[PDB]
Design a protein around this ligand. Structure first.
Ligand SMILES: O=C(Nc1cccc2c(=O)cc(-c3nnn[nH]3)oc12)c1ccc(OCCCCc2ccccc2)cc1
Ligand SMILES: CCCCCCCC/C=C\CCCCCCCC(=O)OC[C@H](O)CO
Ligand SMILES: CCCCCCCC/C=C\CCCCCCCC(=O)OC[C@H](O)CO
Ligand SMILES: CCCCCCCC/C=C\CCCCCCCC(=O)OC[C@H](O)CO
Ligand SMILES: CCCCCCCC/C=C\CCCCCCCC(=O)OC[C@H](O)CO
Ligand SMILES: CCCCCCCC/C=C\CCCCCCCC(=O)O
Ligand code: NA
Length: 395
């Protein structure tokens, strides 16, 4: 099988060396810039900022171990470093991968509560709660990825020191299969379901809030448009027609919530004054109608300008960015889950089932060894997804 192994080795060494090199550069210069900004911007403390520091740290710790993988594949697949470094480099990539998944999961759940429940949400109170979730993730990942720090050393047919190889003996094949099933369910399927559930709730909340904001702008546009009709009208019939259209628009806008009061309680003084503003405006429309019905067409135009002062002193101060930053967070994490994490966990499942099988011909082994090169490189590319999270989300 010496000819069979060397065939895939040509692809394996070329692709891994080229991809890990750019992933090391883009990862270091990307996350390094992200961490530099977050440290300088200490005055503005957010739950999103807590997850961004932790994501960059987990990436920097991984990109520092990635050039050791470059040296390995450049040197025709021979490990020039120590046995501990082979164990630590393999450990670092898994730690980073599952830290990234759990941090992006917790970030999605914390943003979901901030969007669905904006009244009970407190920016600095959730920040302290996010710090406890981060250490809870770190302690879990470090202790669960520990069997790889005490793993058996990998050797070739000519006793050559090898690294990042599939399990050799049947005992190691069993020890990693037990870890695979746990890390597939707890470390991928469940956090993926959480992201699918969280994002369904977020888009639904935003789709409703944007629609209600569109109706509020439509009612305020007609209120200003019909006010221009009254001053331009010559007869009372045109004035009375616009006032009935204005009264209907003023009642609709009174029920709807403005974007500046999304974080405020429906019984708060801010929401009570907004409703009271339209209560005076409706009364002023009816007072103008009472004069328009009397035949006083000119005198009704003065009352239409009298309610314009009420609009400026009660409804103007109430009539955002949170929607844009949430949408950006959805895209980046979804792209990271479909490109980085999903092909890795899919291929790994197919790979371990193949290794346990008795019949394994050269052509079939060639596909599995080529597929893992692609998926593991994409799994390692998760460090390139996090700098984009800063640029497209949470300010
Ligand atoms: O079977 C595995 N890998 C594998 C199979 C077949 C072939 C190969 C292969 O050719 C090359 C590599 C390789 N991995 N890195 N570099 N090269 O790996 C292979 C494998 C199993 C488990 C695992 O991590 C589980 C612990 C994570 C912590 C965790 C625990 C509980 C909940 C959540 C999180 C990781 C890899
Ligand atoms: C903004 C990101 C732009 C993306 C561009 C990334 C720059 C890649 C540079 C060097 C990788 C070296 C790979 C060559 C392998 C050595 C043989
Ligand atoms: C936030 C996440 C909380 C969710 C927590 C839920 C607990 C997960 C329970 C079971 C997962 C299934 C993994 C079972 C792995 C058993 C290993 C095994 O023995 O199976 C291999 C078999 O022996 C060889 O064919
Ligand atoms: C995401 C889909 C990744 C598929 C993984 C894969 O390629 O494994 C299939 C097998 O190797 C093909 O015979
Ligand atoms: C690896 C590739 C992963 C690409 C993933 C997502 C792209 C995000 C695009 C989201 C577009 C939102 C519009 C925008 O540019 O965001 C405003 C920005 O925050 C103000 O500068
Ligand atoms: C071993 C590396 C784990 C240490 C990283 C924990 C990050 C702490 C933090 O800044 O929140
Ligand atoms: Na990451």
């Amino acid at each position: 099988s010496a000819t069979c192994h060397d065939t895939i080795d040509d692809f394996r060494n070329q692709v891994y060396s080229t991809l890990y090199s750019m992933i090391s550069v883009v990862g270091f210069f990307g996350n390094g810039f992200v961490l530099y900004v977050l440290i300088k911007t200490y005055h503005k403390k957010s739950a999103f900022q807590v997850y961004m520091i932790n994501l960059a740290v987990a990436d920097l710790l991984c990109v520092c171990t990635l050039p050791l993988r470059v040296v390995y594949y450049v040197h025709k697949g021979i490990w020039l470093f120590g046995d501990f470094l082979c164990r630590l480099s393999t450990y670092a990539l898994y730690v980073n991968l599952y830290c990234s998944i759990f941090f992006m999961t917790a970030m999605s759940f914390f943003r979901c509560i901030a969007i669905v429940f904006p009244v009970q949400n407190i920016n600095l109170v959730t920040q302290k709660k996010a710090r406890f979730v981060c250490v809870g993730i770190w302690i879990f990942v470090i202790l669960t990825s520990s069997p790889f720090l005490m793993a058996k050393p990998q050797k070739d047919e000519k006793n050559n020191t090898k690294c990042f190889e599939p399990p050799q003996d049947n005992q190691t094949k069993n020890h990693v299969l037990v870890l695979h099933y746990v890390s597939l369910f707890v470390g991928f399927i469940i956090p993926f379901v959480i992201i699918i559930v969280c994002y369904t709730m977020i888009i639904l909340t935003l789709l409703k809030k944007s629609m209600k904001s569109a109706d509020l702008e439509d009612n305020w546009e007609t209120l200003n448009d019909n006010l221009k009709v009254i001053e331009k009208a010559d007869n009372a019939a045109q004035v009375k027609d616009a006032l009935t259209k204005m009264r209907a628009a003023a009642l609709d806008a009174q029920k709807a919530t403005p974007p500046k009061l999304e974080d405020k309680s429906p019984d708060s003084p801010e929401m009570k004054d907004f409703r009271h503003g339209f209560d005076i405006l409706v009364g002023q429309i009816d007072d103008a109608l009472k004069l328009a019905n009397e035949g006083k067409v000119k005198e009704a135009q003065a009352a239409a300008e009298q309610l314009k002062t009420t609009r400026n002193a009660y409804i103007q101060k109430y009539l955002l960015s949170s929607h844009k930053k949430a949408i950006g967070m959805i895209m980046v994490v979804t792209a990271a889950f479909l490109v980085s994490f999903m092909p890795y966990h899919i291929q790994r499942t197919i790979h371990l089932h193949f290794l346990h099988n008795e019949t394994k011909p050269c052509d079939s082994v060639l596909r599995m060894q080529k597929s893992v090169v692609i998926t593991l490189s994409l799994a390692a590319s998760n460090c390139c997804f996090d700098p984009l999270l800063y640029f497209f989300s949470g300010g």
